[model samples]
Target: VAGDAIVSFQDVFFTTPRGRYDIDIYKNSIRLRGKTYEYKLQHRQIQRIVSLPKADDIHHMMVMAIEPPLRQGQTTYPFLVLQFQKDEETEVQLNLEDEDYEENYKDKLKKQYDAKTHIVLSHVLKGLTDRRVIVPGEYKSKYDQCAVSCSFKANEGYLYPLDNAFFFLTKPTLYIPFSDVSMVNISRRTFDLEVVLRSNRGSTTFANISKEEQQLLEQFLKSKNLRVKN
Candidate 1:
């Protein structure tokens, strides 16, 4: 009797090492402690889990649904995007392919005059990483601006103490939807990407989902006051 069901699932999130993130779906009907998550096309709702505003600088994220019998390509999954910046850093830098003599966009993106500029995040990023990591090797000269690399510092080590402490109480917000998803057929890409099956965030905004689902999820949020799980 479950068409596209966002059946209540008990999910847990953890920060494992620097380049690893895990989301464990414990229960489905009863919210147990470690099963798989099945993402279906019909269930377009937000399944709230934990957030990591105080976690390390996130490089990438992968999602997978392990429930509903592990149908290879039976169901459609969700979409995920960082709530951070959509801003761009622009500079009219002249480039030269004198080294390789190959016509490539990479060469054209290099600074011509051996100079560069940068712009920080549009808003004040309260955390440690308040800058952008752009233009690859644009830091050849002093004029090249650098974003705050909130990554692991040699002296400070790779521990996010403040963010770890913040985890003790307040949870940050991340948006996930169904529309932003491209494919659901699982294979190698699903496993190598450090996937986690998280709760949905239909109420919060993202690049995917339909208008009808958005409105309905909004109503659901108003009822739950925007908490992750209801």
Candidate 2:
């Protein structure tokens, strides 16, 4: 018989530069392959791995970030935001019956287990990314406030200034860390703001921000030693 699946063929993720693709987790790396697309990642090319809880209990998110971003034509995707199950019965057999697959990878990776896929994926991610991993613990803003309301393109959403990153929620949510930001450009007249990232990816502009959000976000950025320009 054949081995079980790692993820579904038509899986959805954030930062794809649409409807999702086949997410294949391999021995040394991971990939998103579709009928007309393919993106394979090396083990150590990523920067951080974040696991954030969703609206429900059974589902959560796996957010993987990288520098310079993944490019498709003119668009660049710097993050991989995917929804994974809390637990499931999943199994896979090795392509090799060799000693190393048995002696090295077996105990570290379960051949068969009914558990959270992201957790198992985290074990498989032993060297796939940097050592930093967050499993949803106390993440709050320095201002102790809720997210700001803003609109991007045709969608309206909330923008959260968290301790570690700027999270724009719903309909193509984006996660940009403070460490990756190069500058913030804001306009007093139109309330249009742009966050230029250091990754060479492009930028995100939020329209119709409140004066309070503008002031507080600038203060927070300046506190973090980032630049705020006109």
Candidate 3:
């Protein structure tokens, strides 16, 4: 069994930490990156022989390229992505429990979200709310005079304002102007993650909402079995 435990894959391979063992992976009689290369099972170190070595800059880029598959069941570990900034490196702390399934999620969404991941994710919020995946709602700033959330700013589009006045609008639109979107803020807490879409004008389209509006919209959409923007 010791001899069999040591194996090599001439094909590409890759791996991510799982429990203790980096589970061996094979595809089409060939080992894919991160799948075939596994560390030493005994000392938990590199054997330098048929054992998976640490990934270099190329390997890291490859990992970012290919999407990781999601493991089924509640016992599945949360996959995460830790971004480091040159200046903020000292301030950052790594917490496993506060993990987000970003790595795995990015992989799954790579197929659908593609280049417009941020744009689509923001748009989907309303859809999810309308489809009952998430509760629909609006947000409140310090004062009630904040109409930016109620109005279209840059990439904020007409959807949110329509959502703000969904019942009153004569027409609902889905076409979003992604060009005006400056950047997206994505955050994670524990197993949950939030995608904050911010426009160039600093509008609160996808990032902010109220609890009452969320609950009210979620319940209302659930009864409709409907979705926004199709």
Candidate 4:
């Protein structure tokens, strides 16, 4: 049986499928419901919680990257693209007994949060799930917004150059952790980026990148000491 929700968000915005959802956060999981879909995000299944801004800098975007992705027939949602307004405020309270709080959450989080919704939510999820939340650091996007406008598989999205990985938001959301990449090939003539996988898998090519964006990516790669072929 499901317990009462500790926190809830109404009419949540999603970027990938571009829809609205209602989210109910329990102690161990979150239930997300949309017009025709409902997904239960279990705490253990969530591997990463990434919080950052959108390309235009209008709203905040959060990515819940799961280990075993959610699926509907032939489609697989490995990550959820949740967007929130910049100024949105919220409060969170973990309803637990004194002993429970001390035993499970003492060092992880505070009992209450009265701050920006996204920041508070990130902390809450991290505390509850014990998963690290990835934030933008070191390498900055060309926009200075932590995101560079790019396209992959003929679809438009934002490419976030992070300290340890590269994240592509919107449709066909992809996450490339630097640990698993053998090398990267940046073709300037066609404005393409080919990411060679470490062991078994081959590569993923992102196209329609700008010239300046290409330069920025190359510089960022070189700075990180990752192999880059121009």
Candidate 5:
């Protein structure tokens, strides 16, 4: 039912001159076309969308973030910022030839803009399933040190657990392939989960996760031919 929903709009351009850019919306994707730039995003690749109100009489801003694809050398997710221009001729006439402008014209335009934004956001929510493919979680890791003492620090960011790879979001992010995970341990007392990789070389510890998160991680691990131990 959710997958069957489709909506489309064509030749949409924001702020810029009319012929400079083009935009098209589809069932579960968006396409942007410009003179030199083109971008497209599927529903599954979208991580989040944020809307911000502009100060004074400036334009509003909306951001769309897409989850990064895993690679040998990994980093952060990709994001795009969209600017929605508001009516600049609200108080004064910007054009001398325009005669159809009404007192409530700006308000009506804003309402239409909001309605379209709502439709896009609703589709995003509908595309979400119960699987933990992408999540926001906190992780604290230990530093490389001697056996006598240890130093650890924590960071808060998003987590992406794909079918073949697991990624931890941080300043210098970590990406681990399923084949490298030798063992997995879930700690009930500490509310933590740890994954041991091949050859005892390194491990990843996910801290401050709830029971549901633990379960989801375990499920993902099992799906990838990895073992989870309590």
Candidate 6:
């Protein structure tokens, strides 16, 4: 019965100074209960679920990511972290509750949560949005491993492929939406490759990629109905 529930836990408290809240998870929705607020959120509105390691416990911390109606430049998301334990069933605990807290506590947790959660939530978001790309080595980003980006001047990070956007893991990061990709061009060299994305925002390029790596990326994009202008 516990496993049957998508996520079920008794009293879970968020990082806020609010009271402990009860929550029930379903296939496409979540129910939240507390003295002051009771709310429901559908899966469509949820952007991601970020998990974190608790400082002093077996349970982990999780942040629910949601999209706001109005988007802004590098804006912060709302809310606090909800800590839980994952096993045969996910249990929520409140051991880290505030006897006292830091002003930077939430910000620190948000960074930690986003850092690790992207690994799983990237695919989870793809699955929910029906934007999952299927192919061999789908988990791997074909271009990043073999290339150095001349344009960005940073070539040490992986590309994060999410449901709607792709982000280069550079300092501060560069986010590119699929809808904005007007054209994807691939140019091959003796041992390297260049990928240029022409978008409404501007052009972003992945430069100096290995030949084999470029082919892999090109093939996957084609499989996803993205035309690669070679």
TM-score of each: 0.16, 0.57, 0.17, 0.89, 0.35, 0.38
- List per-candidate RMSD values in Å: 21.6, 5.7, 20.4, 2.3, 14.3, 13.2
Q: Report, for all candidates in order, the number of backbone clashes.
A: 11, 1, 10, 0, 0, 0
The all-Cα superposition gives candidate 1 an RMSD in Å to the true structure of 21.6
| Candidate with better TM-score, 1 vs 3 | 3
Task: Specify the highest-TM-score model's number.
Answer: 4
Local accuracy of candidate 5 as per-residue lDDT tens digits, 109-184: 2112234442433333333311122222222222211011111136653345545555543323445677888988
Model 2, position 161, has a per-residue lDDT of 65
lDDT leader: 4
Question: Could you tell which candidate, 2 or 3, scores higher by lDDT?
Answer: 2
lDDT of 6 by residue, 57-162 (tens): 4655454445541122344334335655432242232122243223323322211122232233333334333333221224244433322233345554434444
Model 1 spans > 4 angstroms off? 1-101, 111-116, 119-202, 205-230
Clashing pairs in 2: 43-128
Query: Which is superior by TM-score, 1 or 6?
Result: 6
| Global fold similarity of model 5 (TM-score) | 0.35
Query: Clashes in model 3: which pairs?
Result: 12-32, 12-33, 13-32, 13-33, 13-34, 14-33, 14-34, 14-35, 15-34, 25-35
For candidate 3, write residues 176-229 as lDDT tens digits: 223333332322211111222334344233333333244333343334332322
Question: Which residue runs does candidate 6 get wrong by more than 4 Å?
Answer: 1-91, 94-151, 161-164, 189-199
State the weakest 10-residue window (summed lDDT) of model 1. Answer: 158-167
lDDT of every model, 2 decimals: 0.22, 0.63, 0.24, 0.80, 0.45, 0.45
Q: Rank the candidates by TM-score, best first.
A: 4, 2, 6, 5, 3, 1
Error of 2 at 51 (Å): 1.2
**Model 2 shows how many backbone clashes?**
1
